């Protein structure tokens, strides 16, 4: 059976989205440089260690889906300089998203999260993303263009034995889900910095960690149209850190108004005909 | 032909949404009391007078759709005590919205706006709302439950001669739009405080002002699922005014996390498993 298409971020940039549109998945080799991976890991390290279980009884919005040993850290902008500067302004990411979401309009981050999977983590059941947060997406027409996509960026090696992601190629076009089986999957073997790109309709799952020793880490960036509400909020991110960002990064974090692709678009998150950034006089690229 | 169903807010509360679901429109008599209408008008009065044309070249997000003589004022919470307290906590509104959006989950305000139509304002073309801001909604399946609804509340008399709203009953179920004609419409004749409730699929239009003397005013409250992005932002609303609101009102204005109806919902606008209100220690019902 056919393996997941592997593409260069440097040379095959224009081919990435068309490949995902056709096959439902693609591996972007060296999506992030090893330098960026190093700084990202270093910066988020302590936050994953202090992170409680997904469904901790202390939590207001517990995640009852993730395995108890998994640790997920989101709202990365205040944590990571590498995230807020390098990945939020990624030329590759923005070309792909604009290719993907041009029919709808502006896009933003629905969630940027670092996930660390513990040794012996079981495989996730095969699934499509967004079904625990956006019931609306299930009511979209079969041939509706994807309203969100997910960059699954390896922050440590993804191998068959340590639970590399499974995908079913072509499953993003499936309506009948009777052929859903692990038999139909292929793996996303990836070095740190490589990214598996899927859509919200791609049937997939995290793999089983079978060594009992290896800890697998990833950065999952769900990019979606600005008409859909993010899973995470940046409302509590201090103004100085927000004002250190680029205007593009500010928009991605919901600290700007947004536009649809409607010919006479009237906009989203506006204030009496004016933008958030104009109204609040929000500065950009201010060193903190 | 059949007139728009008229229902009591006091006695027919449970009948309102089922009526709209069947017919695409209903008039809620005395949705707001004359007291509330009086205070709302008094409070927004100066803001509509200073409001520039919809597509003013000074604006960041000009509205090129509205007639040039129309004035629209949104982000009403900081303007109006009556809006932020009485209408945002309306028992009738919240019963209707929970009836309407239970399949999806939480709902919030997509836009609360006062609109003043000038004398001799032409009729709007027949349309469905949301097509200039949320292209996504057009891609929803025909029988998908409505993801937004619009309360068109009369703040002055709605008459046939001064441009009362037109609706086509049953048009919310239409797929073929060849029978779209003013021939098929009925009017929403309303006293101040009455509300015309429609869905995002109800074909309708503002009527022609034919007297050349009367100024018509309305409060349009588009309520929609929390999975859809609002047309307006409350990000710049001062913290003291936000903290004077009820928790329910805070949620409606995007100053709280939100929940979907998914059995193991993971939430919207959360912060590492905790809500906005918990994280920021947001107070409620603090007199200012
Ligand atoms: C144990 O098996 C699983 C675990 C997760 C999902 C799916 C999701 C999801 O739809 N959204 C995302 C997106 C990024 C990161 C996490 C999540 C997440 O939390 N869940 C629940 C399915 C099955
Ligand atoms: C001149 O004819 C028109 C004027 C408006 C619309 C429709 C909308 C709309 O879809 N959303 C709303 C919702 C509330 C209040 C205003 C608006 C609005 O601004 N437009 C553009 C159509 C036709
Ligand atoms: Br997991
Ligand atoms: Br994974
Ligand atoms: Br108008
Ligand atoms: Br109207
Ligand atoms: K699942
Ligand atoms: K129109
Ligand atoms: Ni997944
Ligand atoms: Ni309308």
From Swiss-Prot, chains A, B:
Domain of life: Eukaryota
Family named by the database record: Belongs to the PhyH family.
GO molecular function: dioxygenase activity; metal ion binding
Record EC number: 1.14.11.81
Designated name of the protein: Iron/alpha-ketoglutarate-dependent dioxygenase asqJ
Source organism of the structure: Emericella nidulans (strain FGSC A4 / ATCC 38163 / CBS 112.46 / NRRL 194 / M139) (Aspergillus nidulans)
Example GO biological process: biosynthetic process
Stretch forming the signal peptide: none
Keyword Oxidoreductase: yes
Self-association and partners: Homodimer.
UniProtKB keywords: Dioxygenase, Iron, Metal-binding, Oxidoreductase
Hydrolase listed as a keyword: no
Required co-factors: Fe cation
EC class name: oxidoreductase
Coiled coil: none
Pathway: Secondary metabolite biosynthesis; Alkaloid biosynthesis; Mycotoxin biosynthesis
Chain positions recorded as Fe cation binding sites: 127, 129, 204
Shown residues within the full chain: 116 to 403 of 416
Record's catalysed reaction(s): (-)-4'-methoxycyclopeptine + 2-oxoglutarate + O2 = (Z)-4'-methoxydehydrocyclopeptine + succinate + CO2 + H2O; (Z)-4'-methoxydehydrocyclopeptine + 2-oxoglutarate + O2 = (-)-4'-methoxycyclopenine + succinate + CO2; (-)-cyclopeptine + 2-oxoglutarate + O2 = (Z)-dehydrocyclopeptine + succinate + CO2 + H2O; (Z)-dehydrocyclopeptine + 2-oxoglutarate + O2 = (-)-cyclopenine + succinate + CO2
Role description: Iron/alpha-ketoglutarate-dependent dioxygenase; part of the gene cluster that mediates the biosynthesis of the aspoquinolone mycotoxins. Within the pathway, the iron/alpha-ketoglutarate-dependent dioxygenase asqJ acts as a (-)-cyclopenine synthase that converts 4'-methoxycyclopeptin into 4'-methoxydehydrocyclopeptin through dehydrogenation to form a double bond between C-alpha and C-beta of the O-methyltyrosine side chain.
């Amino acid at each position: 059976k056919s393996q997941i298409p592997r593409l260069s971020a440097i040379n095959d940039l224009h081919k990435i989205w068309p490949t995902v549109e056709e096959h439902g998945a693609a591996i972007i080799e060296s999506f992030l440089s090893l330098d960026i991976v190093r700084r990202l890991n270093e910066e988020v390290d302590p936050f994953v260690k202090i992170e409680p279980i997904p469904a901790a009884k202390t939590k207001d919005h517990p995640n009852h889906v993730l395995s108890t040993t998994t640790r997920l850290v989101n709202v990365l902008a205040p944590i990571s300089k590498a995230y807020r500067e390098d990945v939020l302004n990624s030329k590759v990411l923005h070309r792909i998203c604009s290719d993907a979401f041009h029919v709808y309009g502006d896009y933003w981050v629905l969630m940027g999260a670092v996930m660390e999977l513990a040794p012996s983590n079981p495989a996730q059941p095969l699934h499509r993303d967004m079904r625990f947060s956006h019931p609306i997406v299930e009511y979209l027409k079969p041939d509706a263009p994807a309203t969100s996509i997910n960059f699954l960026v390896a922050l440590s090696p993804f191998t068959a034995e340590n639970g590399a992601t499974h995908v079913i190629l072509g499953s993003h076009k499936w309506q009948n889900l009777s052929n859903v089986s692990m038999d139909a999957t292929v793996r996303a073997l990836m070095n740190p910095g490589d990214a598996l790109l899927i859509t919200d309709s791609t049937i997939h799952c995290g793999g089983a960690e079978t060594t009992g020793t290896e800890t697998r880490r990833l950065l999952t960036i769900t990019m979606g149209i600005s008409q859909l509400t993010p899973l995470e909020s940046n409302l509590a991110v201090p103004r100085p850190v927000i004002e250190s960002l680029t205007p593009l990064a500010q928009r991605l974090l919901g600290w700007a108004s947004q536009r649809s692709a409607a010919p006479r678009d009237i906009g989203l998150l506006t204030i009496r005909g004016n933008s958030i950034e104009k109204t609040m006089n929000l500065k950009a690229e201010q060193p903190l």
